[PDB]
Design a protein around this ligand. Structure first.
Ligand code: BXZ
Length: 207
């Protein structure tokens, strides 16, 4: 298990998300589904010239898996997946510059819901999650698990869990007061409101 420090700017972003009074937390799901869509677009694009890229899984989709016993909401996609380097480099984002822009926008009157416009939507997960685990598999790398409960550090390890063919799984370990996001009707509402034009099947698992 390797432990890394967040860049100061990203730690600042995370504290802002965790500490700011802001009621419209539901947008985290839109942001994660958008990320999944982007990753699915990437593997589809690659497959247009090299169909063997889909040998690790032909179906391009997004699954939403609530588990009330574990208090987790898991978002699974069969997108391109991230390499170990992607994970370490802020989950494939340019988060330092994105955070700078986001901060400046907030000071000018923007609100947290606009986070995705700055390319750092992943971190909105911390609106509702006390811990986030990201399991990922790219065609050109091994399966890795990234994890952070904020507090300035994240870990990366090779994943010995259930193998995924290809793609990314974001496991949200929800805060005690945010269990509404495990309820079918609430999740359905959010998907319908914010993700109407995502061009991949979004399947909400039931329990
Ligand atoms: O260059 C990239 C950037 C992000 C992702 C992702 C990804 C990252 C997050 Br974070 C997420 O929530 C969902 C994803 O599919 N999978 O593969 C990628 C490749």
């Amino acid at each position: 298990v390797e432990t890394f420090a967040f860049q100061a700017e990203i730690a600042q972003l995370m504290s802002l998300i965790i500490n700011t009074f802001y009621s419209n937390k539901e947008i985290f799901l839109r942001e994660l589904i958008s990320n999944s869509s982007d990753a699915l677009d990437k593997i589809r694009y690659e497959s247009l010239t090299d169909p063997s890229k889909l040998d690790s899984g032909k179906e391009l989709h997004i699954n939403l898996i609530p588990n009330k016993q574990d208090r987790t909401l898991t978002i699974v996609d069969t997108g391109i997946g991230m390499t170990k380097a992607d994970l370490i480099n802020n989950l494939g984002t340019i988060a330092k510059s994105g955070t700078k822009a986001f901060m400046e926008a907030l000071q000018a009157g923007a609100d947290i819901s606009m986070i995705g416009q700055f390319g750092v939507g992943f971190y909105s997960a911390y609106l509702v999650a006390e811990k986030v685990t990201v399991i990922t598999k790219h065609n050109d790398d091994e399966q890795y698990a990234w994890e952070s409960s904020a507090g300035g550090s994240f870990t990366v390890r090779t994943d010995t869990g259930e193998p995924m063919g290809r793609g990314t799984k974001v496991i949200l370990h929800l805060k005690e007061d945010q269990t509404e996001y495990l309820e079918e009707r609430r999740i359905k509402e959010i998907v319908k409101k914010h993700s109407q034009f995502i061009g991949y099947p979004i399947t909400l698992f039931v329990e």
